[PDB]
Structure formats: C-alpha cells, structure tokens
PDB file of C-alpha atoms and ligand atoms in Angstrom:
ATOM      1  CA  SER A   1      98.156  16.230  26.248  1.00  0.00           C
ATOM      2  CA  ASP A   2      95.007  14.259  25.486  1.00  0.00           C
ATOM      3  CA  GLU A   3      92.688  16.211  23.218  1.00  0.00           C
ATOM      4  CA  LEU A   4      89.959  13.539  23.143  1.00  0.00           C
ATOM      5  CA  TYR A   5      89.820  13.537  26.948  1.00  0.00           C
ATOM      6  CA  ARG A   6      89.907  17.336  27.157  1.00  0.00           C
ATOM      7  CA  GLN A   7      87.131  17.897  24.622  1.00  0.00           C
ATOM      8  CA  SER A   8      84.934  15.154  26.102  1.00  0.00           C
ATOM      9  CA  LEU A   9      85.292  16.605  29.594  1.00  0.00           C
ATOM     10  CA  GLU A  10      84.465  20.070  28.251  1.00  0.00           C
ATOM     11  CA  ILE A  11      81.301  18.863  26.500  1.00  0.00           C
ATOM     12  CA  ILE A  12      80.080  16.564  29.270  1.00  0.00           C
ATOM     13  CA  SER A  13      80.787  18.974  32.133  1.00  0.00           C
ATOM     14  CA  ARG A  14      79.102  21.852  30.308  1.00  0.00           C
ATOM     15  CA  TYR A  15      76.025  19.751  29.535  1.00  0.00           C
ATOM     16  CA  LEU A  16      75.701  18.507  33.132  1.00  0.00           C
ATOM     17  CA  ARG A  17      76.134  21.994  34.632  1.00  0.00           C
ATOM     18  CA  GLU A  18      73.583  23.530  32.236  1.00  0.00           C
ATOM     19  CA  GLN A  19      71.051  20.763  32.928  1.00  0.00           C
ATOM     20  CA  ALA A  20      71.454  21.274  36.672  1.00  0.00           C
ATOM     21  CA  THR A  21      71.354  25.095  36.721  1.00  0.00           C
ATOM     22  CA  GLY A  22      69.242  25.969  33.663  1.00  0.00           C
ATOM     23  CA  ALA A  23      71.850  28.537  32.600  1.00  0.00           C
ATOM     24  CA  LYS A  24      74.133  28.445  29.553  1.00  0.00           C
ATOM     25  CA  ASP A  25      77.890  29.005  29.803  1.00  0.00           C
ATOM     26  CA  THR A  26      78.901  31.968  27.619  1.00  0.00           C
ATOM     27  CA  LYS A  27      82.639  31.285  27.942  1.00  0.00           C
ATOM     28  CA  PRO A  28      84.426  30.305  24.699  1.00  0.00           C
ATOM     29  CA  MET A  29      85.283  26.663  23.975  1.00  0.00           C
ATOM     30  CA  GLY A  30      88.848  25.458  24.537  1.00  0.00           C
ATOM     31  CA  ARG A  31      89.606  25.071  20.833  1.00  0.00           C
ATOM     32  CA  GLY A  33      85.421  24.617  19.470  1.00  0.00           C
ATOM     33  CA  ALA A  34      82.932  24.571  16.603  1.00  0.00           C
ATOM     34  CA  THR A  35      82.688  20.803  17.048  1.00  0.00           C
ATOM     35  CA  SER A  36      82.105  21.150  20.786  1.00  0.00           C
ATOM     36  CA  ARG A  37      79.336  23.702  20.251  1.00  0.00           C
ATOM     37  CA  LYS A  38      77.637  21.341  17.796  1.00  0.00           C
ATOM     38  CA  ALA A  39      78.060  18.371  20.168  1.00  0.00           C
ATOM     39  CA  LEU A  40      76.502  20.313  23.032  1.00  0.00           C
ATOM     40  CA  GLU A  41      73.572  21.358  20.794  1.00  0.00           C
ATOM     41  CA  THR A  42      73.112  17.693  19.847  1.00  0.00           C
ATOM     42  CA  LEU A  43      73.085  16.645  23.513  1.00  0.00           C
ATOM     43  CA  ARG A  44      70.450  19.238  24.422  1.00  0.00           C
ATOM     44  CA  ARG A  45      68.144  17.756  21.804  1.00  0.00           C
ATOM     45  CA  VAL A  46      68.815  14.028  22.126  1.00  0.00           C
ATOM     46  CA  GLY A  47      69.585  13.981  25.850  1.00  0.00           C
ATOM     47  CA  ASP A  48      66.421  15.728  26.932  1.00  0.00           C
ATOM     48  CA  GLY A  49      64.410  13.156  24.972  1.00  0.00           C
ATOM     49  CA  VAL A  50      66.318  10.277  26.541  1.00  0.00           C
ATOM     50  CA  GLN A  51      65.640  11.588  30.050  1.00  0.00           C
ATOM     51  CA  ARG A  52      61.924  11.891  29.245  1.00  0.00           C
ATOM     52  CA  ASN A  53      61.669   8.437  27.679  1.00  0.00           C
ATOM     53  CA  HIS A  54      63.514   6.701  30.492  1.00  0.00           C
ATOM     54  CA  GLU A  55      62.257   8.618  33.514  1.00  0.00           C
ATOM     55  CA  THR A  56      61.237   5.457  35.353  1.00  0.00           C
ATOM     56  CA  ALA A  57      64.471   3.537  34.725  1.00  0.00           C
ATOM     57  CA  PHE A  58      66.511   6.614  35.640  1.00  0.00           C
ATOM     58  CA  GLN A  59      64.576   7.130  38.890  1.00  0.00           C
ATOM     59  CA  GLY A  60      65.232   3.474  39.751  1.00  0.00           C
ATOM     60  CA  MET A  61      68.959   3.689  39.067  1.00  0.00           C
ATOM     61  CA  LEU A  62      69.232   6.952  41.000  1.00  0.00           C
ATOM     62  CA  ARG A  63      67.546   5.400  44.048  1.00  0.00           C
ATOM     63  CA  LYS A  64      69.791   2.333  43.847  1.00  0.00           C
ATOM     64  CA  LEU A  65      72.758   4.667  44.046  1.00  0.00           C
ATOM     65  CA  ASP A  66      72.339   6.705  47.195  1.00  0.00           C
ATOM     66  CA  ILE A  67      74.182   9.844  46.329  1.00  0.00           C
ATOM     67  CA  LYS A  68      74.177  12.268  49.232  1.00  0.00           C
ATOM     68  CA  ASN A  69      77.770  13.512  49.273  1.00  0.00           C
ATOM     69  CA  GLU A  70      81.128  13.516  47.490  1.00  0.00           C
ATOM     70  CA  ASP A  71      82.047  10.091  48.844  1.00  0.00           C
ATOM     71  CA  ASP A  72      78.988   8.553  47.143  1.00  0.00           C
ATOM     72  CA  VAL A  73      80.011  10.068  43.799  1.00  0.00           C
ATOM     73  CA  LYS A  74      83.430   8.419  44.079  1.00  0.00           C
ATOM     74  CA  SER A  75      81.861   4.965  44.450  1.00  0.00           C
ATOM     75  CA  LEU A  76      79.205   5.137  41.726  1.00  0.00           C
ATOM     76  CA  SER A  77      82.090   4.622  39.267  1.00  0.00           C
ATOM     77  CA  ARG A  78      81.925   0.914  40.109  1.00  0.00           C
ATOM     78  CA  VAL A  79      78.315   0.561  39.012  1.00  0.00           C
ATOM     79  CA  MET A  80      78.861   2.791  35.984  1.00  0.00           C
ATOM     80  CA  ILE A  81      81.749   0.722  34.649  1.00  0.00           C
ATOM     81  CA  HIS A  82      79.853  -2.501  35.328  1.00  0.00           C
ATOM     82  CA  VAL A  83      76.730  -1.498  33.419  1.00  0.00           C
ATOM     83  CA  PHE A  84      78.425   0.493  30.633  1.00  0.00           C
ATOM     84  CA  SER A  85      81.246  -1.929  29.763  1.00  0.00           C
ATOM     85  CA  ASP A  86      78.934  -4.920  29.362  1.00  0.00           C
ATOM     86  CA  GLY A  87      77.473  -5.503  25.914  1.00  0.00           C
ATOM     87  CA  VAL A  88      77.948  -3.724  22.615  1.00  0.00           C
ATOM     88  CA  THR A  89      79.175  -0.197  21.946  1.00  0.00           C
ATOM     89  CA  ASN A  90      77.048   2.426  20.185  1.00  0.00           C
ATOM     90  CA  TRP A  91      76.262   6.132  20.210  1.00  0.00           C
ATOM     91  CA  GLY A  92      72.839   5.513  21.767  1.00  0.00           C
ATOM     92  CA  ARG A  93      74.393   3.985  24.873  1.00  0.00           C
ATOM     93  CA  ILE A  94      76.904   6.820  25.074  1.00  0.00           C
ATOM     94  CA  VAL A  95      74.011   9.318  25.019  1.00  0.00           C
ATOM     95  CA  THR A  96      72.265   7.265  27.721  1.00  0.00           C
ATOM     96  CA  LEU A  97      75.437   7.417  29.865  1.00  0.00           C
ATOM     97  CA  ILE A  98      75.657  11.197  29.558  1.00  0.00           C
ATOM     98  CA  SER A  99      71.876  11.750  29.880  1.00  0.00           C
ATOM     99  CA  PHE A 100      71.740   9.792  33.101  1.00  0.00           C
ATOM    100  CA  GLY A 101      74.679  11.935  34.200  1.00  0.00           C
ATOM    101  CA  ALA A 102      72.511  15.031  33.671  1.00  0.00           C
ATOM    102  CA  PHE A 103      69.680  13.348  35.559  1.00  0.00           C
ATOM    103  CA  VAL A 104      71.982  12.790  38.538  1.00  0.00           C
ATOM    104  CA  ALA A 105      73.378  16.319  38.257  1.00  0.00           C
ATOM    105  CA  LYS A 106      69.825  17.728  38.565  1.00  0.00           C
ATOM    106  CA  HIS A 107      69.340  15.593  41.639  1.00  0.00           C
ATOM    107  CA  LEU A 108      72.629  16.824  43.116  1.00  0.00           C
ATOM    108  CA  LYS A 109      71.554  20.433  42.758  1.00  0.00           C
ATOM    109  CA  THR A 110      68.251  19.753  44.539  1.00  0.00           C
ATOM    110  CA  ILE A 111      70.052  18.340  47.572  1.00  0.00           C
ATOM    111  CA  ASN A 112      72.477  21.277  47.680  1.00  0.00           C
ATOM    112  CA  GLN A 113      75.439  19.272  46.368  1.00  0.00           C
ATOM    113  CA  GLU A 114      76.136  21.234  43.174  1.00  0.00           C
ATOM    114  CA  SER A 115      79.909  20.998  43.730  1.00  0.00           C
ATOM    115  CA  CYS A 116      79.608  17.220  43.250  1.00  0.00           C
ATOM    116  CA  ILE A 117      78.683  17.790  39.616  1.00  0.00           C
ATOM    117  CA  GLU A 118      82.380  18.344  38.799  1.00  0.00           C
ATOM    118  CA  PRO A 119      83.695  14.969  40.017  1.00  0.00           C
ATOM    119  CA  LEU A 120      80.591  13.387  38.471  1.00  0.00           C
ATOM    120  CA  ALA A 121      81.447  14.838  35.048  1.00  0.00           C
ATOM    121  CA  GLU A 122      85.075  13.809  35.498  1.00  0.00           C
ATOM    122  CA  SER A 123      84.060  10.243  36.398  1.00  0.00           C
ATOM    123  CA  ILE A 124      81.722   9.905  33.409  1.00  0.00           C
ATOM    124  CA  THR A 125      84.389  11.258  31.050  1.00  0.00           C
ATOM    125  CA  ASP A 126      87.040   8.995  32.483  1.00  0.00           C
ATOM    126  CA  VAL A 127      84.910   5.851  32.086  1.00  0.00           C
ATOM    127  CA  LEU A 128      83.863   6.841  28.565  1.00  0.00           C
ATOM    128  CA  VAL A 129      87.295   7.618  27.241  1.00  0.00           C
ATOM    129  CA  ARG A 130      89.169   4.848  29.092  1.00  0.00           C
ATOM    130  CA  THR A 131      86.797   2.066  28.055  1.00  0.00           C
ATOM    131  CA  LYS A 132      85.875   3.272  24.555  1.00  0.00           C
ATOM    132  CA  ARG A 133      89.101   5.004  23.399  1.00  0.00           C
ATOM    133  CA  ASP A 134      89.740   3.042  20.213  1.00  0.00           C
ATOM    134  CA  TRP A 135      86.045   2.900  19.251  1.00  0.00           C
ATOM    135  CA  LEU A 136      85.726   6.664  19.697  1.00  0.00           C
ATOM    136  CA  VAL A 137      88.809   7.265  17.563  1.00  0.00           C
ATOM    137  CA  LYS A 138      87.493   4.935  14.800  1.00  0.00           C
ATOM    138  CA  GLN A 139      84.099   6.647  14.946  1.00  0.00           C
ATOM    139  CA  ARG A 140      85.819  10.073  14.482  1.00  0.00           C
ATOM    140  CA  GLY A 141      85.086  11.253  18.012  1.00  0.00           C
ATOM    141  CA  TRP A 142      82.717  14.132  18.582  1.00  0.00           C
ATOM    142  CA  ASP A 143      82.582  14.935  14.867  1.00  0.00           C
ATOM    143  CA  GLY A 144      81.241  11.404  14.388  1.00  0.00           C
ATOM    144  CA  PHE A 145      78.730  11.966  17.199  1.00  0.00           C
ATOM    145  CA  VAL A 146      77.413  15.146  15.608  1.00  0.00           C
ATOM    146  CA  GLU A 147      77.161  13.446  12.208  1.00  0.00           C
ATOM    147  CA  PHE A 148      75.345  10.394  13.632  1.00  0.00           C
ATOM    148  CA  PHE A 149      72.569  12.482  15.204  1.00  0.00           C
ATOM    149  CA  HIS A 150      72.403  15.161  12.476  1.00  0.00           C
ATOM    150  CA  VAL A 151      68.934  16.669  11.811  1.00  0.00           C
TER     151      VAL A 151
HETATM  152  N1  LIG P 201      70.679  -1.360  39.752  1.00  0.00           N
HETATM  153  C1  LIG P 201      69.993  -0.947  38.703  1.00  0.00           C
HETATM  154  C2  LIG P 201      70.338  -1.325  37.389  1.00  0.00           C
HETATM  155  C3  LIG P 201      71.435  -2.157  37.188  1.00  0.00           C
HETATM  156  C4  LIG P 201      71.781  -2.538  35.877  1.00  0.00           C
HETATM  157  C5  LIG P 201      71.027  -2.072  34.788  1.00  0.00           C
HETATM  158  C6  LIG P 201      69.928  -1.220  34.998  1.00  0.00           C
HETATM  159  O1  LIG P 201      69.173  -0.748  33.879  1.00  0.00           O
HETATM  160  C7  LIG P 201      68.334   0.384  34.142  1.00  0.00           C
HETATM  161  C8  LIG P 201      67.913   0.899  32.759  1.00  0.00           C
HETATM  162  N2  LIG P 201      66.903   0.461  32.007  1.00  0.00           N
HETATM  163  N3  LIG P 201      66.820   1.113  30.865  1.00  0.00           N
HETATM  164  C9  LIG P 201      65.838   0.879  29.836  1.00  0.00           C
HETATM  165  C10 LIG P 201      67.796   2.042  30.791  1.00  0.00           C
HETATM  166  C11 LIG P 201      68.042   3.035  29.597  1.00  0.00           C
HETATM  167  C12 LIG P 201      68.553   1.945  31.998  1.00  0.00           C
HETATM  168  C13 LIG P 201      69.798   2.828  32.396  1.00  0.00           C
HETATM  169  C14 LIG P 201      69.724   3.686  33.476  1.00  0.00           C
HETATM  170  C15 LIG P 201      70.834   4.471  33.815  1.00  0.00           C
HETATM  171  C16 LIG P 201      72.018   4.427  33.069  1.00  0.00           C
HETATM  172  C17 LIG P 201      72.087   3.569  31.971  1.00  0.00           C
HETATM  173  C18 LIG P 201      70.991   2.770  31.636  1.00  0.00           C
HETATM  174  N4  LIG P 201      71.301   2.037  30.553  1.00  0.00           N
HETATM  175  C19 LIG P 201      72.544   2.304  30.170  1.00  0.00           C
HETATM  176  C20 LIG P 201      73.163   1.638  28.992  1.00  0.00           C
HETATM  177  O2  LIG P 201      72.420   1.079  28.149  1.00  0.00           O
HETATM  178  O3  LIG P 201      74.408   1.621  28.856  1.00  0.00           O
HETATM  179  C21 LIG P 201      73.128   3.263  31.011  1.00  0.00           C
HETATM  180  C22 LIG P 201      74.551   3.889  30.935  1.00  0.00           C
HETATM  181  C23 LIG P 201      75.607   3.057  31.583  1.00  0.00           C
HETATM  182  C24 LIG P 201      75.474   3.079  33.101  1.00  0.00           C
HETATM  183  O4  LIG P 201      75.536   4.465  33.465  1.00  0.00           O
HETATM  184  C25 LIG P 201      75.604   4.742  34.845  1.00  0.00           C
HETATM  185  C26 LIG P 201      75.434   3.731  35.776  1.00  0.00           C
HETATM  186  C27 LIG P 201      75.516   4.056  37.133  1.00  0.00           C
HETATM  187  C28 LIG P 201      75.756   5.381  37.542  1.00  0.00           C
HETATM  188  C29 LIG P 201      75.910   6.399  36.587  1.00  0.00           C
HETATM  189  C30 LIG P 201      75.834   6.084  35.254  1.00  0.00           C
HETATM  190  C31 LIG P 201      75.989   7.097  34.265  1.00  0.00           C
HETATM  191  C32 LIG P 201      76.224   8.403  34.679  1.00  0.00           C
HETATM  192  C33 LIG P 201      76.301   8.727  36.048  1.00  0.00           C
HETATM  193  C34 LIG P 201      76.147   7.727  37.002  1.00  0.00           C
HETATM  194  C35 LIG P 201      69.574  -0.849  36.293  1.00  0.00           C
HETATM  195  C36 LIG P 201      72.157  -2.593  38.343  1.00  0.00           C
HETATM  196  C37 LIG P 201      71.729  -2.162  39.604  1.00  0.00           C
END
C-alpha cells in the first residue's frame, strides 16, 4: 500500500478527466474529505494558471507532439527534466498538474481521451517519486489545501 500515491493519482486523474470532458465525477472518493477539498482547490488555482500561461503552455504542447499513446510514454523524459530542476514549491506542483489538464484537453480534441489515464499516471509517478519526502514534510494534500486556502 501507498496512500500518498493512491490519493495523488485519485486527485490528479479526476482533475484531468473533468478538465477534458467538462463533467464532474459523482463517484465517492477512495477514503476523502481532503481529496474533495484538493480537487476544489485545483479547479480554482489550476484554471487561473492555464489562463495566465496560455502562451507558454501552447509552446510546450507543440514541442511535445502528442498524437498517440506512444507519445505519452515518452513525454515523461521532458517532464522529469523540467520539473526536477530547481527548487520545490506548491506553485510548481500546481503548474505541473495544470499543464497536465491542458494536455488532457488537447488529447480529447484529437480523439485520444483514453491517453488521459496514462498521462495522469505519469504525472503522479513523477510527482510522488521525485518529491516524496518534501510532500510528506509539507503534510501532503492537507498541506496543499491549507497553502491555497481562501
Ligand atoms: N521545450 C520547451 C520548454 C522547455 C523547458 C522549459 C519550458 O518552460 C515553458 C514555461 N514557461 N513558463 C512561464 C511556464 C509556467 C512554463 C511551463 C510549461 C509547461 C509545464 C511547466 C512549465 N513550468 C513548469 C515548472 O515551473 O515546473 C512546468 C511543470 C514541469 C514540467 O511539466 C511538464 C513538462 C513536459 C510535459 C508535461 C509536463 C507536465 C504535465 C504533462 C506533461 C519550455 C524545454 C523544451
């Protein structure tokens, strides 16, 4: 078991799917209150990030050339490269996930909605593998919710 991984995947995959489809998942969370609050936080902060960084996000998306599942498997390289360099903070974590939603929207437009699942899995894996101890020290998703509160 790996609760931090499980909860992160739940939050990130739900946010990406909802951003792509425009529809909210009514299914209960795997455990719960924290995840609901995290997802609410992402809707608010993430939508702003996508608006503020439209041009940068378009540029990154073009540089990747996601067309199929094989492209999604390789974008991990770029993601790790850009995300692991420099300092760690919640703003960069929101940027990581927000760009994920941006790509997920693109995937839906090119009829590759199934690729959203490995995309979410890849984002979660990079986040939790590279930032494990920082996330734990920052109190995980409870810390995230607190950081961006009101
Ligand atoms: N091609 C393009 C780029 C390369 C390195 C850096 C770069 O910066 C573009 C940029 N500029 N601003 C102001 C922002 C914000 C960004 C940007 C765009 C997309 C993603 C991110 C950023 N900045 C950050 C950050 O500060 O950590 C990120 C998140 C980490 C990288 O996330 C990535 C990267 C690649 C694919 C995916 C991804 C996240 C989710 C899904 C896919 C432009 C080098 C070459």
